[PDB]
Design a protein around this ligand. Structure first.
Ligand SMILES: [Zn+2]
Lengths: 86, 228, 100, 71, 48, 228, 228
């Protein structure tokens, strides 16, 4: 596939260029819903779907409604695989 | 003990006020609103003989309409209710007299501070055209020297100053004024000429409706005004 | 809600169920092997774990259908053998059953 | 656009199993999600028929306990 | 046989359906290390 | 005016075209559908003795249907309607004329190209069958020399090609072919025989039903075509 | 073909156990619930002229109840049912029978253990009281040698101790007793008089109610007891 690996440093610019958001809330879980917090260390709002293709809107079921972000959840709609790496 | 067809009609009228009763021996039945404000009494052609509580008296009357009339009705060995045909033997579960509240007594209605009577088509008319105009309460009051029945939309007018329907049974010669207010839902009574008694004492007050098959004593509302 | 030690388990072949007792405790002497069940213990469902494939049936049968699910004590795969004794422990003042 | 014919959907939903061949349950749940169908507003979409075979194959697959067998 | 998840699924299929053939892919836990060094600012990359 | 039960039934049927109505001076009623596609008119025997715009006519009919028949229907003091029999009264607030949608004038439909008739039993049968196989549209054409109504469901029979039912409106000896299309939603014609007068030109099209009492008018659907 | 009002009636009550059906050329129809527990059957003095299944018997017979009975029931050209009305030619789709559980043979009822009979009033009366008492279980037993029914609501009564209904069905000339248990969700026959055969051995059984038009074979509930 691909040729040589390169190493370098990263201006904080490029750090921004990576992240799909920014985390501020120090906590994670509701301990009742056991769901991620609103803006926390696990929150979907940046990382993404805990299930695949649907979030706490319950709004998007099939490939017809995949992709486009929610407004209640705010999170994009996709498979949970990408959460592993963002 | 048989429940006649007129018995079944009055049982219908009473099961409206309550879907159950505590049947008590006599030629009489009676039941109370769950609030006890509007009450039904009727000395009936049938004589009650065993006191028995019934929870779904409307459904009980259904069951009655499911079996032939002259089936012998008794209180069964286990205490329940036996309907007995030449063939059909049915045990309706006899209720507990505390699951269904019964009225303390037939209301010893006081003396009427005012008297009129509502015709059959009169009550039919008021209570049925209330659906076209959405009448939710009634004002029986001295108007042009008459005992007028003004159908007021207490939702749209809690003051009862916007008439969309009134009924004027007859003129009532009087100086002592009043504007009795009674819920259109207090009118538990079947159609027909109902002699209207308007008792008025302080804030306690009542409209006794004396029909053709039962007396219903209706406690006036806290907004019913009366002035002697 | 709490859980039960019934002999009442969903989506399992009654063939297996027979081997238990009326309580849900298999008898003394039953030569057993892995991939089987020795006690039946069932839990209420919960919400975030409800798949459409049962949303169907709970719609139809009335939600009195998918309220519980299995946690039964199995027989650890790779083992066989014979039952020798069964101890049953309960809170006192709480009901004590047949085996107890 | 609008697909309110229940028995036509029966013709279409037997296509699921008879074509795909997993089970009536999974076939029709696939239908429900493909066209994004909830489970309380279905009587307007689903033939009155498939429901009965669903019940049949369900109780035969033992989806629920003996508590449901007797009735 | 270890990590190529897509790869191992494809294998499992092809073998259980009579086709011994391998799709190489690229390891997964390696990517884990990749992001793990991406953690610290040491920007790592995979040139063309 | 004291509208008869026939007249009030006609009012209830015209309500199927519009709740909002402008009952005008005369013995005549004049209405149009809210989408501007259906039109209704009918000469009555009583005289509307005061112009009035009503928003909910069927409840007006219920108000008419329960009171003593000697009820006097006139204009109330407040520029609205009053319906008061010999002993009671009913007020009806008249909707504003600047808030009701209706034809400026009668639609006479002064021209037709395809004349046919349709009677009572086939009327009810089409009304029921189009409910029965989810037929949502009728198409009037000539198939083997007959003015025939072909019923179709548009979402699944897009070109209206599935004749699951062919109803013949009458014979046809004529060279002018057409697709006079009417979508079922405009079907408001009551029990009664109807002379269907079909006119069309270019893209515009209208089918008229001249009944035992009234005229209905429908704008023929946009794909309606005419070859003269 | 054409199907008499009694024929369409047999189909109407066949739709009660299973929605649609699989009909073959001939003069007999049969149907069974997909549980296998109930099976209604009746010959028809009308004749069927080909092999088809109907997915919706209800809408079918309804669209047929609007045509005068002379309408011919043939196959359509496009593979569905063509009912040439006296004036129309309606088409309803033909269900591919594999999608409806067609019985491969008519059920023979082998030698019954016990014999008695039900009647119109008895059967229909029980049908109705099973509602007002929500009775789910009916337990046919012998009392003093008399074949009778005892009604239970199994939900509120596991071993069925609460007889909620009792009727005299007839005599049993013997001592060999039983409690043949049946769910009320299987008593789908129209009201009428019926002969009553009971095959019962060991664990299995069959209740045969024979009517003035048809025969109904219903699987007893396994909880039943019997000895002969
Ligand atoms: Zn959301």
């Amino acid at each position: 596939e691909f040729d040589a690996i390169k190493i370098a440093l990263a201006s904080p610019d490029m750090i921004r260029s990576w992240s799909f958001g920014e985390v501020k809330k120090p906590e994670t879980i509701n301990y009742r819903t056991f769901k991620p917090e609103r803006d926390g260390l696990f929150c979907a709002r940046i990382f993404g779907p805990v299930k695949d293709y649907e979030c706490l809107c319950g709004k998007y079921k099939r490939l017809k409604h995949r992709g486009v972000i929610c407004e209640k959840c705010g999170v994009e709609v996709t498979q949970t695989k990408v959460r592993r790496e963002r | 003990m048989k429940l006649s067809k007129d018995t079944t009609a009055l049982l219908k009228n009473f099961a409206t006020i309550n879907s159950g009763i505590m049947l008590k021996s006599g030629q009489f039945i009676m039941t109370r609103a769950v609030n006890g404000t509007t009450y039904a009494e009727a000395n009936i052609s049938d004589v009650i003989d065993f006191d028995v509580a019934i929870y779904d008296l409307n459904g009980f009357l259904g069951i009655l309409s499911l079996v032939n009339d002259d089936a012998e009705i008794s209180q069964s060995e286990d205490g329940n209710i036996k309907i007995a045909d030449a063939r059909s033997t049915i045990f309706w579960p006899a209720a507990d007299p505390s699951t269904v509240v019964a009225p303390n007594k037939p209301i010893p209605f006081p003396v009427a501070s005012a008297v009129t009577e509502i015709k059959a088509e009169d009550l039919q008319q008021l209570l049925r055209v209330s659906r076209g105009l959405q009448i939710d309460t009634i004002a029986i009051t001295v108007k042009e020297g008459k005992i007028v029945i003004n159908g007021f939309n207490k939702v749209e007018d809690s003051a009862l100053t916007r008439v969309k329907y009134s009924l004027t049974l007859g003129d009532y010669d009087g100086e002592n004024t009043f504007n009795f207010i009674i819920n259109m839902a207090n009118m538990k009574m079947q159609p027909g000429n109902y002699k209207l008694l308007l008792w008025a004492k302080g804030k306690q007050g009542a409209a006794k409706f004396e029909g053709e098959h039962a007396n219903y004593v209706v406690a006036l509302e806290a907004d019913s005004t009366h002035d002697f | 809600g709490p859980e039960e030690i019934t002999a009442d388990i969903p989506n399992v072949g009654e063939a297996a169920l027979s081997k238990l007792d009326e309580s849900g405790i298999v008898y003394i002497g039953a030569e057993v092997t892995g991939g089987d069940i020795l006690v039946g213990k069932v839990t209420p469902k919960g919400e975030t774990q409800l798949t459409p494939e049962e949303k169907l049936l709970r719609a139809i049968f009335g939600e009195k259908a998918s309220d519980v699910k299995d946690s039964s004590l199995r027989v650890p795969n790779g083992v066989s053998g014979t039952v020798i004794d069964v101890q049953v422990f309960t809170r006192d003042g709480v009901e004590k059953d047949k085996r107890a | 656009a609008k697909l309110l014919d229940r028995q036509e959907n029966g013709f279409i939903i037997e296509k699921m199993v008879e074509e795909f061949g997993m089970s009536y349950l999974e076939a029709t749940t696939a239908f429900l999600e493909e066209n994004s169908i909830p489970e309380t507003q279905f009587a307007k979409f689903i033939p009155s028929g498939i429901i009965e075979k669903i019940q049949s194959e369900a109780i035969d697959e033992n989806l629920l306990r003996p508590s449901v067998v007797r009735c | 046989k270890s990590d190529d998840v897509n790869g191992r699924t494809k294998m499992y299929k092809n073998i259980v359906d009579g086709n011994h053939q391998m799709e190489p892919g690229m390891p997964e836990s390696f990517n884990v290390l990749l992001k793990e060094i991406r953690s610290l600012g040491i920007n790592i990359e995979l040139e063309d």
